[PDB]
Ligand binder design. Structure first.
Ligand SMILES: Nc1ccn([C@H]2CC[C@@H](COP(=O)(O)OP(=O)(O)OP(=O)(O)O)O2)c(=O)n1
Ligand SMILES: Nc1ccn([C@H]2CC[C@@H](COP(=O)(O)OP(=O)(O)OP(=O)(O)O)O2)c(=O)n1
Ligand SMILES: [Mn+2]
Length: 579
DNA sequence: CCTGACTCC
DNA sequence: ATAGGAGTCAGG
C-alpha cells in the first residue's frame, strides 16, 4: 500500500535539499547504541538504506552534515547523538515532529511517530511498540518489515510537517519551535555527547567508607529495635515502629502505615530509633543511587557519564535528566554533598563553572503578576528567601543560616503556589490558625500576587488551558470537575505552570544565547549540564575571568522583565568546589 | 510493574 | 484534601 525502494547503494536522488529522515535507534538509551536502519522520503521517492550502506558512503555522510540540506525528523536529538557515537555529524534539521507535538499538547505523552500522527488523524503508520515488541520480547524484525516501518515513519513526517506547523502558527507557537526548542535540541545533543567526567577512585573510596558507616547505623538500629529486620521495607519498618514500639500513627497510606521522613521527624521525641532510621535511609540512598547506581553508568574507558535530557516530557516545559539523573545530585547535607567531589573537569587544568538564577520564579511571578511590592523588593535587590527566614525564625539577617534560608524558600514557593493552612502548619509545626494567619499576612504584603492567582484560575476555567511567556501551553480539562480534589489539583496547576514554565523558557533561551557567545569568541568553555535554573560548564582555568563576566551577563539578559534578573556564580576544581 | 522511600529544582 | 515539577532505588 506504500511503494519504496530497498536500496543497495546511495543514489543522487536520495540526497535532495529537503527530506524526511529516519535514523532508527531502538534502544531507549541511545548513547553508543545500534542504528538499525535508515529511511529517506523526498520529492523523488521513498528509500530504505541499511546502516552499513549509508553510513560508510561518503556522499550520504556529507549530505547528513550539510546544513543546507534540510531534514524533517522525529526526535532529532536521538539521531544526532547516535550518529555522533558513530563518528558522524548531523546538520540541517529544520523540523522535529516530536518537539512540535510536545508544544501543541504536552499531555498527549507523544513518544513515537504514530502517537503524533494520531493528533492529525493520520493512520498510515504503526506504533513502535507494535513492531518491536516489549520487554524481553523486544527485537528488530525482518528487513522487509523493518524497512516498511521506517519508510512509513518518514512518509508520516513528510506529510505531517505542514499540518503541524499550521497548527503551531495558529497558536503563535511556531517561533517557540523553530527559534527555541529546535536549536536547544542541538545544544543538548552536544552536552549529552560530551558527558561529565567522574573521579572513580574517589567515588569508590567514598563508597567503601559509606558501607562501613551504614553497617554501624544498621546495627545501632537493630539494637534499639531489639531485633533484626529490613529497614528498607516500609512494611516491616511499620511493624517495628507502630506495633512493636507502639509509636503513634500519624498517617496511613493505601498499603499501610506511613514512614515518610515528614512523619518520622515528628516521632523523634518518642524514640531515638527514628533519627537513626532517617540517617540510615539517607546513607542507603547515597549508596544505592549516587555511588553504586552512578558507577554502573560510568563508561569505563573514559570515566564519563552521559545523561539524556528529556526535552519532550514534562508538563511545564522543564527538561528532565535520566540514566543517570544529574539534576538531583545531593547538596543539602554535607554528607551527601561530598558526592559532587567526584564530578570533575574532563581535562587537566580545567575547572567547573556553575551559575544559578537568584530567586528565579519569584522574579518571574513579580513580572507576570505585576505585584508592586514584589517588583519593588527586586528593584532593591532584597532576598525574599532570607527575609521569610528572619520572619519565621525570628532572627536577624546575619543570623539566617543557609539551611533556614532553604526552609524559607520552600515556604515562599509553597505559599504562592497554594499550600493550605494544614500543609504549612505541618511543615512549620505551628498551629493551623497561626499558619492561616501567616498566609493571610503574606498575601497582604503581596496583594497583586493574590489577585493574579485568583484571576489565572478563572482564566483557566474559561479557556481550558494556561500559557507561558514564550507561548508554551498546558491544557487543564479537569479544572471544572465537580469533584473537589480533582478540581483543586487543576487549579493549583493553573497557579504554578505559567510561572515554572516561564522560568523554563528563560533558561532555555539563555542556553541558546550563551552557546552562541561561546562559539563566536572561540572559547573552549562548553556546557555540561542544565539543572532547571542553573547552568554548569567546564573550561580551561585561563577562561574563568571571561566566564565570570560572560555567563552571568548572558543569563541575566536572556529576557527583559519588569524586574531585574540576577545570577549567582562560582567555579572550582570539582562540582563540589564550585560554590 | 507499583509503592513509597530519598534526591533535586 | 491540603504548593508545583521531576528520577531511581529496594521491596512489595
Ligand atoms: N508566531 C509566534 C509568535 C510568538 N511566539 C512566542 C515567542 C515570543 C513570544 C511573544 O511573542 P511576541 O512577538 O512578543 O508577541 P506579543 O504580542 O508582542 O507578545 P504576546 O502576544 O505574548 O502578548 O511568543 C511564537 O512562538 N510564535
Ligand atoms: N522547594 C522548591 C524549590 C524550587 N522550586 C522551583 C522554584 C524555584 C526554582 C529554582 O530552584 P532554586 O534555585 O532552589 O530556587 P531560587 O528561588 O532560584 O533560589 P536561589 O536564590 O537560592 O537560587 O525551582 C520549587 O518550586 N520548590
Ligand atoms: Mn535559583
Amino acid at each position: 500500500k506504500m511503494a519504496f525502494t530497498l536500496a543497495d547503494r546511495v543514489t543522487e536522488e536520495m540526497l535532495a535539499d529537503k527530506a524526511a529522515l529516519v535514523v532508527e535507534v531502538v534502544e531507549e538509551n541511545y548513547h553508543d547504541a545500534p542504528i538499525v536502519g535508515i529511511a529517506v522520503v523526498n520529492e523523488h521517492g521513498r528509500f530504505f538504506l541499511r546502516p552499513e550502506t549509508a553510513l560508510a558512503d561518503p556522499q550520504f555522510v556529507a549530505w547528513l552534515g550539510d546544513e543546507t540540506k534540510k531534514k524533517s525528523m522525529f526526535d532529532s536529538k536521538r539521531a544526532a547523538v547516535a550518529l555522533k557515537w558513530k563518528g558522524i555529524e548531523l546538520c540541517g534539521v529544520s523540523f522535529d515532529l516530536l518537539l512540535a507535538a510536545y508544544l501543541l499538547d504536552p499531555a498527549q505523552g507523544v513518544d513515537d511517530v504514530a502517537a503524533a500522527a494520531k493528533m492529525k488523524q493520520y493512520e498510515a503508520v504503526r506504533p513502535d511498540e507494535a513492531v518491536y515488541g516489549k520487554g524481553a520480547k523486544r527485537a528488530v524484525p525482518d528487513e522487509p518489515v523493518l524497512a516498511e516501518h521506517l519508510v512509513r515513519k518518514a512518509a508520516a513526517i513528510w506529510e505531517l510537517e505542514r499540518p503541524f506547523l499550521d497548527e503551531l502558527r495558529r497558536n503563535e507557537q511556531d517561533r517557540l519551535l523553530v527559534e527555541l526548542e529546535q536549536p536547544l535540541s542541538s545544544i543538548l545533543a552536544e552536552m549529552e555527547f560530551a558527558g561529565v567526567k567522574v573521579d572513580t577512585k574517589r567515588l569508590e573510596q567514598m563508597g567503601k567508607e559509606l558501607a562501613e558507616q551504614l553497617g554501624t547505623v544498621e546495627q545501632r538500629i537493630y539494637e534499639l529495635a531489639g531485633q533484626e529486620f529490613n529497614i528498607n521495607s516500609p512494611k516491616q519498618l511499620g511493624v517495628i515502629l507502630f506495633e512493636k514500639l507502639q509509636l503513634p500513627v500519624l498517617k496511613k497510606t493505601k498499603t499501610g502505615y506511613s514512614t515518610s521522613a515528614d512523619v518520622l521527624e515528628k516521632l523523634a521525641p518518642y524514640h531515638e530509633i527514628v533519627e537513626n532510621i532517617l540517617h540510615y535511609r539517607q546513607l542507603g540512598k547515597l549508596q544505592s543511587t549516587y555511588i553504586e547506581g552512578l558507577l554502573k553508568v560510568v563508561r569505563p574507558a573514559t570515566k564519563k557519564v552521559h545523561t539524556i535530557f528529556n526535552q519532550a516530557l514534562t508538563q511545564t516545559g522543564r527538561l528532565s535528566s535520566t540514566e543517570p539523573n544529574l539534576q538531583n545530585i545531593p547538596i543539602r547535607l554535607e554528607e551527601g554533598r561530598k558526592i559532587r567531589q567526584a564530578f570533575v573537569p574532563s581535562e587537566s587544568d580545567w575547572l567547573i563553572f556553575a551559575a544559578d538564577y537568584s530567586q528565579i520564579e519569584l522574579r518571574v511571578l513579580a513580572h507576570i503578576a505585576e505585584d508592586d511590592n514584589l517588583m519593588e523588593a527586586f528593584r532593591r535587590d532584597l532576598d525574599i528567601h532570607t527575609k521569610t527566614a528572619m520572619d519565621i525564625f525570628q532572627v536577624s539577617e546575619d543570623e539566617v543560616t543557609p539551611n533556614m534560608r532553604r526552609q524559607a524558600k520552600a515556604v515562599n514557593y509553597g505559599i504562592v503556589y497554594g499550600i493550605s493552612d494544614y500543609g504549612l502548619a505541618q511543615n512549620l509545626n505551628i498551629s493551623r490558625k497561626e499558619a492561616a494567619e501567616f498566609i493571610e499576612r503574606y498575601f497582604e504584603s503581596f496583594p497583586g500576587v493574590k489577585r493574579y492567582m485568583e484571576n489565572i484560575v478563572q482564566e483557566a476555567k474559561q479557556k481550558g488551558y494556561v500559557t507561558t511567556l514564550l507561548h508554551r501551553r498546558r491544557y487543564l480539562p479537569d479544572i471544572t470537575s465537580r469533584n473537589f480534589n480533582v478540581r483543586s489539583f487543576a487549579e493549583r496547576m493553573a497557579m504554578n505552570t505559567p510561572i515554572q514554565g516561564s522560568a523554563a523558557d528563560i533558561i532555555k533561551k539563555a542556553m541558546i544565547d550563551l552557546n552562541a557567545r561561546l562559539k563566536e569568541e572561540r572559547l573552549q568553555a562548553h556546557l555540561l549540564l542544565q539543572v532547571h535554573d542553573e547552568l554548569i560548564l567546564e573550561a580551561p582555568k585561563e577562561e574563568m575571568e571571561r566566564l565570570c563576566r560572560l555567563v552571568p551577563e548572558v543569563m541575566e539578559q536572556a529576557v527583559t522583565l519588569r524586574v531585574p534578573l540576577k545570577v549567582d556564580y562560582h567555579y572550582g576544581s570539582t562540582w563540589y568546589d564550585a560554590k
